[PDB]
Subunit: 45 residues, 3 copies
Amino acid sequence: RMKQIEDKIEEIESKQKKIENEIARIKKLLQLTVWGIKQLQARIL
Amino acid sequence: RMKQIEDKIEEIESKQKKIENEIARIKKLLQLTVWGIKQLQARIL
Amino acid sequence: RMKQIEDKIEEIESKQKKIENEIARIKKLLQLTVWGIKQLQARIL
Ligand SMILES: [Cl-]
């Protein structure tokens, strides 16, 4: 029973790391889109 | 303590699935914004 | 062994709450980028 809990925790921690990595990718891409939009705003000023 | 832990695991797993689904929705919307920015760059050229 | 499991659970719960707060912040920024793109699209309709 405790082994099964411990193993479930490993799977959850693994999935949580995949989630943190996806959030980091999202943040980088969102930064790039904000920069892109600001470049377009400056062009039409 | 074991049963409480199992109940908490079930909760965590449920929320993790919801988080994964929200990340998938965010990624799709972010891709649409990248396409929208590229279409504006194309158009100004 | 049981206290180690409980401490790890608590750590996973706290990281999950932080992930949910990060997702909320990303969604608000993404909505702003969408409205910024729409504004730019208009300035060329
Ligand atoms: Cl065991």
